Amino acid sequence: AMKILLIGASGTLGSAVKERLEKKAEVITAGRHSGDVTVDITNIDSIKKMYEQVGKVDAIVSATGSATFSPLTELTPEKNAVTISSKLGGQINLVLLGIDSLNDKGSFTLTTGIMMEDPIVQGASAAMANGAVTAFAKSAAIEMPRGIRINTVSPNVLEESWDKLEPFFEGFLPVPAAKVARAFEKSVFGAQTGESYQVY
Amino acid sequence: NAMKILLIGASGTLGSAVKERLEKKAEVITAGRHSGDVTVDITNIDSIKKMYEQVGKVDAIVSATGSATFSPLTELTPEKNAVTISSKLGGQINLVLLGIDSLNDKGSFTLTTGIMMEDPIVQGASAAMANGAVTAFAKSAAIEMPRGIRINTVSPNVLEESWDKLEPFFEGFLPVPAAKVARAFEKSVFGAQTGESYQVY
């Protein structure tokens, strides 16, 4: 009777993750504007209320988070802050505020991405977030109570986004969202922790 | 040829070892919160901008500064984690976002990370985050730098000169001399590489 809170279920990645997870578990979806529950991951009061409504689950999965894309020389601290509050801080806050919502031996899975290891123009801000979430999870894994696990999934650019994203990722070879969704399933239904699962 | 370096965090254990090396080869302008030729609160954007107006053009900007909350994971709240975000993480990155215009052609940035992102310890999650964030930012930023500017990071292990206080938290680690880590900073300033993370473990 396994129960998974999936935040970001309506996105491209999120919907491919839901497709795989829902075949073996009861998925509760959450998103900014749609889902079984709504949540603004940039607002800690919102995250706290989502956890109140949701109750106890076995896995919390984040396929969500926004980053500013800007040329470096026009990336100001003010623009950079939107990434910090969402793809970086928002994801990390789900963990900081969600540990008590997981059953024993439950898991967290967060999203990162290839831009941290394979940089592109406009991508410094996304890279920052990806590095931050990867390292936070590696470290947090050693301190989780009650047998809880935490991993990250690092996607390449998705085939399903190649039409819109190719000019940003010239010479890259995109990956299917369904291939990426498999690493989320590996995280949820596997037993490893502190891993960064690359789907490049 | 005549090198000018802005060293932020110069009064710290690491910073002062860095100053000692770089001094021999360049003019070092020191900066800190309460100490230095120029002062700066790196958590405050206008304060960083004022520092850079005061300083003018330099050849290198070196950050051996930035603080991270050192709390057990289950005690680490969003509020506590926000401190790291404004300082070791956001403070060091903002020195880059606000300082490119202060670098001479072919100048460099050097930022500080740490072993806690790679060889984690209890209480280290927030510093790990900051270190990972800064490492990845620098690697990506390196490809967008104008005018031949370089950017690297230095990632130290626990320092021998801090081992007295830090040993209970790093049991079984083997600490490194601050003098050895300072060589990596010299490598970043005086060498010609970019997008590098120089581990001194």
Question: Is the distance from CB of A10 to CB of A35 less than 8 angstroms?
Answer: yes
Chains A, B: CB pairs < 8 Å: 132
Using CB atoms, which residue from B97, B98, B140 is nearest to A115? B140
Cα B144 to Cα B151: distance, rounded to the nearest angstrom: 10
d(CA B25, CA B166): 32
Q: Is residue A55 classed as helix, strand or coil in its secondary structure?
A: coil
B111 to chain A, any CB pair closer than 8 A? The answer is no
How far off is chain A from B57, nearest CA to CA, in Å? 17
Cβ separation A127–B117 shorter than 8 A: no
CATH 3.30.1780.10 for the A1-200 domain, yes or no: no
Question: What SS3 state is found at A187?
Answer: helix
Burial (0-12, 13-18, 19+ Cβ within 10 Å), A55: exposed
* B141-150: b (≥16 Cβ within 10 Å) or e: bbbbbeeebb
- Residue B48: phi and psi, rounded to 5, are -65, -45
The reply to whether residue A44 touches residue B78, judged by beta carbons under 8 angstroms, is yes
Residues of B in contact with A77 (CB under 8 A): 45, 90, 93-94, 97-98
Contact check, Cβ <8 Å, B144/A71: yes
Rounded CA-CA distance A53/A56 in Å is 9
Q: Do B136 and A142 touch (CB under 8 A)?
A: no
Is there a contact between B166 and A146 (Cβ–Cβ < 8 Å)? Answer: no
3-class state of residue A87 by DSSP = helix
Contact B190, B146 (CB under 8 A): no
Beta-sheet strands, E only, within A112-175 = 149-155
- Strand-pair partners of B156: B200
The domain ranges of chain B are 1-201
Decide: B65 and B12 in contact? Cβ < 8 Å. yes
Minimum distance, in Å, between the CA of residue B182 and any CA atom of chain A: 24
Q: Which helix or strand (DSSP H or E) is residue A58 part of?
A: strand A57-62
Q: What is the 3-state secondary structure (H, E, C) of chain B?
A: CCCEEEEECCCCHHHHHHHHHHHCCCEEEEEECCCCCEECCCCCHHHHHHHHHHHCCEEEEEECCCCCCCCCHHHCCHHHHHHHHHHHHHHHHHHHHHHHHHEEEEEEEEEECCHHHCCCCCCCHHHHHHHHHHHHHHHHHHHHCCCCCEEEEEEECCEHHHHHHHHHHCCCCCCECHHHHHHHHHHHHHCCCCCCEEEEC
- Answer whether B117 sits within 8 Å of A138, measured CB to CB: yes
Nearest partner of A180 among A21, A27, A4, A3, judged by Cα: A21
Structure tokens at B70: 């050192």
Residue A69, CB-side half-sphere exposure with 13 Å CA sphere: 11
Chain B contact for A110, CB < 8 A? no
What is the CB-side half-sphere exposure of residue B189 using CA atoms within 13 A? 28
Does residue A197 contact residue A179 with C-beta atoms inside 8 Å? no
- Contact A43/B at CB under 8 A: no
Please indicate if any CB of chain B lies within 8 Å of the CB of A148.
Answer: no
For the domain spanning B1-201, the CATH number is 3.40.50.720
